């Protein structure tokens, strides 16, 4: 499946320029919104927005381009069609068969932060790692009851390589007998994950 | 601003002086690929995507030309207003949980990069380590600054204190983030 790109229009007659086309999908492709943005030194000066239907100046720099691009039917029609030829095409194709089908499973390991001593305070970490995609539920239990006091998780940590990571700490005191279980739920899992640590 | 998924097709970036360019595709935060402007091929971050999808790199190379023009036009049109340099911020963290003697990977997340010219290097006990360094490309932020992650593969031990050296015009002296 081949991917198409948004086509930068040509400007009319250290410094940083950036141009991007962005595709905003809601409920698959039942709602698609399309924005292209032209940025010069962290300031966006023109913009196509499919809700609006035509390039509009965001700043004073942007009037020349917007008024002209809108005047050429070959230019304007090219940009409007990018909602179908870039956004919808891509999602129905490339994305549907790659990222949208990606399911990488959580690696769940429990750890005690300081050597065990019954009737003494320690902290248990449940490292949940190498997963995709991001929607993940991670809860702690002592003996079957959800423990919410003394629990702290990291925010979702984006690894940068199409995997995510989250670390959930529990504060506790191991009594003799008790069972602590990390309870993980993730779309790549048939049934949830429970990992136990016998005190 | 509000959706389920956000694909950003066709992100192009161009800078002056020096004539630097980056062309990439992202989806839900992650880089699908970048076009190598010198080797003129599409480099997929996940190999297994490349075997199932594809992209004519000329699409990138053309876009970069357009931008190169537009930057040139826009420089003149604003009486050459230059970029305010920002101070960037490092964050080191392991990719896996640390187990002594088992090979892992250390990740340096560098954010608020602007402009996207940055030297990011690794120290181990204050000496240059480059064992299996992979750098990602500049990712875009909603405020038009950039982030970028380095990677260092290492064997964890006790006798190792690792640093993350980051150099940039927005920093008087180079900032080190210890781990």
């Amino acid at each position: 499946f081949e991917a198409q790109k948004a086509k930068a229009n040509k400007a009319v007659d250290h410094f940083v320029y950036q141009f991007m086309g962005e595709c905003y999908f809601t409920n698959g492709t039942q709602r698609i919104r399309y924005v292209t943005r032209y940025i010069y030194n962290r300031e966006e000066y023109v913009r196509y927005d499919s809700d609006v239907g035509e390039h509009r100046a965001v700043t004073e720099l942007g009037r020349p381009d917007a008024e002209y691009w809108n005047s050429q039917p070959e230019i304007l029609e090219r940009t409007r069609a990018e909602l179908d030829t870039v956004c919808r095409h891509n999602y129905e194709g490339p994305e549907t068969h790659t990222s949208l089908r990606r399911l990488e499973q959580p690696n769940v390991v429990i750890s005690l932060s300081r050597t065990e001593a019954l009737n003494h305070h320690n902290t248990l970490v449940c490292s949940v790692t190498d997963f995709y995609p991001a929607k993940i539920k991670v809860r702690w239990f002592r003996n079957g009851q959800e423990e919410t006091v003394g629990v702290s998780s990291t925010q979702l940590i984006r690894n940068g390589d199409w995997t995510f990571q989250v670390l959930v700490m529990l504060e506790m005191t191991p009594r003799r007998g008790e069972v602590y279980t990390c309870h993980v739920e993730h779309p790549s899992l048939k049934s949830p994950i429970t990992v136990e640590w016998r005190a | 601003i509000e959706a389920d998924h956000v694909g950003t097709y066709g992100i192009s970036v161009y800078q002056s002086p020096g004539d630097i360019g980056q062309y990439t595709f992202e989806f839900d935060g992650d880089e699908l690929f970048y076009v190598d402007l010198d080797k003129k091929e599409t480099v997929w971050m996940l190999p297994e995507f490349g075997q199932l999808a594809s992209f004519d790199p000329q699409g990138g190379l053309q876009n970069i030309a357009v931008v190169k023009h537009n930057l040139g036009v826009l420089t003149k049109r604003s009486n050459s207003t230059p970029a305010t340099n920002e101070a960037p911020q490092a964050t080191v963290f392991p990719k896996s949980p640390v187990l002594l003697g088992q090979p892992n990977t250390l990740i340096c997340f560098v954010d608020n990069i602007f402009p996207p010219v940055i030297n990011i290097t690794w120290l181990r006990n204050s000496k240059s380590v480059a064992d299996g360094v992979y750098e990602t490309s500049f990712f875009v932020n909603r405020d038009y600054s950039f982030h970028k992650l380095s990677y260092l593969t290492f064997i964890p031990s006790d006798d190792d204190i690792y640093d993350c050296k980051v150099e940039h015009w927005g920093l008087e002296e180079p900032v080190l983030k210890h781990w």
Epitope: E2, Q4, K5, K7, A8, N9, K10, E74, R78, T85 | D56, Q58, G59, L61, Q62, A65, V66, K68, H69
Partner: T-cell receptor, first 111, second 109 residues
Framework: AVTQSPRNKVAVTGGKVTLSCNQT?????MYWYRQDTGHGLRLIHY???????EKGDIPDGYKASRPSQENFSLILELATPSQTSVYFC???????????FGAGTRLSVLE | QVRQSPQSLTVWEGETAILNCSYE??????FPWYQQFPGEGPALLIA?????DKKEDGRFTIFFNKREKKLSLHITDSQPGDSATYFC??????????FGKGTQLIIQP
């Protein structure tokens, strides 16, 4: 307008032939084709701006060069007989629906 | 690859000339025809995008057919001065064009 020079050239083998094309349209892209009976219009090299070039479908034997927005040259360093042909320049806008061709250059590379 | 047929075609004046063309790559979406008179360079004549099954300008029309990946240029009431070589190109996402071998057309008086 798109003007090529020379319009006709006779070169010997191993000889250097440089076809050049000028372009009044302020078009950003330029292209170099060759025409032959049995092959059609085949894209040799092309370009998006001064200082850049791109391989076309039959770039072997030819070296391109675009020193200007206006002008795009095609250089034949070691001219071989198989390069006897009719050469066409073209230009257009970024993503342009339309190409604008020059008149042509009849080139004979003889033995 | 883009393929036209025949290599050469001969039609009586006034009859309709049918010039066939077909393409491999289904990713293509733009199909301009160029017209080349002897001694001149080829020049855009008429064109179609693939979202459409027909484009009609004057005596020249293109009939397009995405499912069969086949393409067609009709010239009605042909005149002697319509005789030239006719190229079929294809474009994909607005990148460079790929032309076919070209069809010669002679209009007999």
């Amino acid at each position: 307008a798109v003007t090529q020079s020379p319009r006709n050239k006779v070169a010997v083998t191993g000889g250097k032939v440089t076809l050049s094309c000028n372009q009044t349209n302020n078009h950003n892209n330029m292209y170099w084709y060759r025409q032959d009976t049995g092959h059609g219009l085949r894209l040799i090299h092309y370009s998006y701006g001064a200082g850049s070039t791109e391989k076309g479908d039959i770039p072997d034997g030819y070296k391109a060069s675009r020193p200007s927005q206006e002008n795009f040259s095609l250089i034949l360093e070691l001219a071989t007989p198989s390069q006897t042909s009719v050469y066409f320049c073209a230009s257009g806008d970024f993503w342009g629906d339309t190409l604008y061709f020059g008149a042509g250059t009849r080139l004979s590379v003889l033995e | 690859q883009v393929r036209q047929s025949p290599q050469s075609l001969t039609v009586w004046e006034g009859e309709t000339a049918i010039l066939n063309c077909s393409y491999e790559n289904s990713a293509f979406d733009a199909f301009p025809w160029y017209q080349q008179f002897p001694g001149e360079g080829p020049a855009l004549l008429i064109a179609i995008r693939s979202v459409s099954d027909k484009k009609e300008d004057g005596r020249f029309t293109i009939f397009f057919n995405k499912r069969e990946k086949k393409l067609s240029l009709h010239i009605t009431d042909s005149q002697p001065g319509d005789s030239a070589t006719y190229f079929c190109a294809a474009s994909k996402g607005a990148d460079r064009l790929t032309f076919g071998k070209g069809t010669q057309l002679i209009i007999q008086p």
